[PDB]
Design a protein around this ligand. Structure first.
Ligand SMILES: O=C([O-])CC(=O)C(=O)O
Ligand SMILES: O=C([O-])CC(=O)C(=O)O
Ligand SMILES: [Cl-]
Lengths: 433, 434
């Protein structure tokens, strides 16, 4: 059966024809720009192209029209376990098609084989102080991988616009292969020489191998391997509007290669209002457990919610900029938890769950939070914590692994369609008067 | 004892917050349309971001709180010696809307010299870089790594009111400005990391002078180059919010990533061939022109070479603007620097820039595919650096990177002071447009 590159090569003509048709309608009006859009971070403004996913305010995120549940049903699984593979999600995002299981196996083999790192990346990582925030470490080491960029070199030689997409593809695959190893090196700074050169099991999936590099390989960790697969698939893409996806696209649009461009995305993911949300939730939950105890009641949880809000604080992991109904990424994680009795017996999980049953009504009554349903960040941290990954500073590093998926797909499409530099116009306050 | 920078900014914040409230009361007002062309065309045409410090005027070029380049050359404080406006003074104007006194700038230059030292780990990180790692990659990486020193990131982690966000933003912005010329010099001088990375700076010298000293271009003998450098860094500090470096800084910053991470994103955008490379392209093109036509050129030779470039299907770099309808006043400010240095004027490469600026606009109009075919700043900057023996064009973007910290850091400070939200547009697929 076709490999990924071949499969992408077969859908490129249909995408280019679709693009030509849309371009023939260039003069068509689709929206207004208001003052609110200028001062409000472009919120509500339909102004960028993004092929792979469309975030529906009522249904949540869809991937070529498929729900999360559709993807959990249709996408190939690992050689063992129950959860859909992130490599299969990548295939679907890129091509618009669901790969066969043996297509995904040949693709997982590519990701295991291209995972090795040049020596200088080991040296760079070993120079980091141990107190350097893990997302800073991750962003820096991805950027540094630009020494290996095929796009950057091919471009420097003279490269036709028609040939841009293929080196972009080769670099994207290279990045995906290497990023879990860079992530594990962030986690395991005393073992950089071992973990940074360890050969990966050639028949295991991307997430399994990631877990092995984290020191969480083997039979004993098989539920965690499924969590990881699900988590990485769920977080791979969420439209083009989010800061990490947009930053990748923006930097990429200047023809910076995928290593540089996704490094910009990771720097945006390091933001407290973007990728660090999950870490903040776990901290807030643990401080709540600390005050009210493991034999907490609804009443305890309700008072702590009210005490948080009355002090002028936010309840993290609730509300969204676009979403209007409960986040189907949150629900898919809650559904994973529902069938693991040991997760359900964990009080920190019980606390997350009870909080998800009470918080939405408290927040509505308090009245300052837009659509106060749980988002994915409400739950992800506590599930990692359960599996003895009790170092919340590193949860965002896993988000960084996942989130390479969707934005790299769109970079490939950007270069294949020949999209120009992203260049809005700016204005001052005095100009708006 | 006149206000320091922080105090001066603190005095204009209330007026800016009142102006912002007034604009916000007009939230529902329509200012333009979104067309299909805008979505597929990289938001070109779309007025969709706030940027306070600079605005492009179609007749007068870039203006900084309404001040032309000529106004800034007249009014802004100069160094203890030399003829050119200081970048520290441009920063002050961008941030505050006001012109600092000369002693205000001196107190500010002293702060920048005092905070210029680097943690040891940044020396170690830079020494790990391979020799072939592109300089902009090195610069972006080392700026990000300075986030270990971020007061915003730690203050935020402790609990910080929204109203106080701007202050740690400001402290980190100043810290970044202080350190970036030392990081830049380390990018230029990878064999001397230990020496250049700990070298004590003259405590009463300006930002650019000290940068030049760290580059190995200190002293009386380099005083004209110190003026060039001052002017270059001032002229390139800000040019609206739409350009990739400014926008990326703003975008990353809007997620509350600290200024080190945020400007590191800008530098990654500046590394992009369609953003960071114009000055290098002009120098190459000018030297290849000198190479083919020699030192004894005439108007007619220059004219034929322009036409031969355009007939080959090639661009004449450093000419053209989308809006601006006269020469770029940044170009002219560089030409005015040259006018008083006889040795620059005797350099044939400069003579070639100049004659080319007198002939190219008419040739390009007659050719007809370049909108407003007047010189831009890039037409001159590279050749002036080349004259001063700064003949490693691969590193010109590093110097642009130093300059371009100025405007975007100012906007980050204003973003946090006004409490602007996360930048998050809506996206759409091709099928949704059809
Ligand atoms: O999968 C889709 O969304 C349809 C598709 O391939 C295209 O847009 O050409
Ligand atoms: O390759 C094509 O047919 C379309 C093209 O030129 C581009 O990528 O801009
Ligand atoms: Cl494959």
């Amino acid at each position: 059966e076709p490999d990924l590159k071949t499969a992408l090569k077969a859908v490129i003509p249909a995408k280019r024809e679709l693009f030509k048709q849309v371009k023939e309608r260039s003069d068509e009006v689709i929206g207004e720009v208001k003052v609110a859009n200028v001062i409000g971070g472009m919120r509500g403004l339909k102004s960028m192209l993004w092929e792979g996913s469309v975030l529906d305010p009522e249904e949540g995120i869809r991937f070529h029209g498929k729900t999360i549940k559709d993807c959990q049903k249709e996408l190939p699984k690992g050689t063992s376990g129950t959860e859909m593979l992130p490599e299969a999600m990548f295939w679907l995002l890129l091509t618009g098609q669901v790969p066969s299981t043996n297509q995904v196996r040949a693709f997982s083999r590519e990701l295991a084989e291209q995972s090795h790192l040049p020596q200088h990346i080991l040296d760079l990582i070993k120079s980091f102080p141990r107190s350097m925030h893990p997302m800073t470490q991750l962003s820096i080491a991805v950027a540094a991988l630009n020494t290996e960029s095929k796009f950057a070199k091919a471009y420097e030689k003279g490269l036709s616009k028609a040939d841009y997409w293929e080196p972009t593809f080769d670099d994207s695959i290279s990045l995906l292969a290497k990023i879990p190893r860079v992530a594990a090196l962030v986690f395991r700074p005393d073992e950089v020489d071992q973990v940074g050169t360890q050969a990966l099991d050639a028949s295991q999936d991307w997430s399994y191998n990631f877990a092995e590099l984290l020191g969480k390989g083997g039979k004993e960790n098989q539920d965690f391997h499924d969590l990881l697969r699900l988590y990485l698939a769920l977080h791979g893409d969420h439209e083009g509007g989010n800061v990490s996806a947009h930053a990748t696209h923006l930097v990429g649009s200047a023809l910076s290669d995928p290593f540089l461009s996704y490094s910009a995305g990771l720097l945006g993911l390091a933001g407290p209002l973007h990728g660090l949300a999950a870490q903040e939730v776990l901290r807030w939950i643990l401080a709540m457990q600390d005050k009210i105890g493991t034999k907490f009641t609804d009443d305890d949880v309700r008072n702590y919610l009210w005490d948080t809000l009355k002090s002028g604080r936010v309840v993290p992991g609730y509300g969204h900029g676009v979403l209007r109904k409960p986040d189907p990424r949150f629900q898919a994680l809650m559904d994973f938890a529902a069938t693991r009795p040991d997760v359900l017996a964990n009080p920190v999980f019980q606390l997350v769950k009870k909080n998800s049953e009470i918080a939405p009504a408290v927040l509505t009554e308090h009245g300052k939070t837009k659509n106060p349903h749980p988002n994915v960040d409400a739950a992800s941290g506590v599930l990692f914590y359960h599996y003895a990954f009790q170092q919340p500073l590193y949860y965002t590093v896993t988000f960084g692994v996942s989130r390479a998926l969707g934005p790299l797909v769109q970079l490939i499409w950007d270069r294949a369609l020949g999209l120009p530099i992203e260049r809005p116009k700016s204005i001052n306050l005095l100009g708006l008067k």
